[PDB]
Amino acid sequence: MEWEMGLQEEFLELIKLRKKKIEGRLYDEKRRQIKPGDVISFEGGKLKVRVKAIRVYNSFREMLEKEGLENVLPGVKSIEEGIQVYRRFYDEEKEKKYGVVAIEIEPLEY
DSSP, X not given: OOEEEOOOHHHHHHHHHTTSSOOOOOOOHHHXXXXXXXXXEETTXXXXXXXXXXXXXXXXXXXXXXXXXXXXXXXXXXHHHHHHHHHHHSOHHHHHHTOBOOOBOOOTTO
C-alpha cells in the first residue's frame, strides 16, 4: 500500500508547509483510494507524505474560509484567487459533482 506522485519542487516544499496547515483537492478516484494510513512518495522519493485524515466540505470557499486559505494554498493572493487556482486545475463540474475534500498531509521527511 504505497502511493506515488510527482510535482514541481516548489510545490513539494508547499507540502512541507502544509504540515502545519492543510491541503485541498477535490475528491477523485485515486483520492478515494487514498486513506489515512499510508505514505505518498513524490518524484520517486523527493517528498514523502503520510495521510493523516480525510475531510469533506461544501467547496473551496468553505474550505479556505473554514480550514483556511493560507492554511491550504500558501502564497495565494486571496480566497477568490485560490478558488481560481482550483478552478483552472480542477473542473467546476467535477467539483460541483462531489465537492471538496481537505486531505491533511504530513511529510515525515524533515
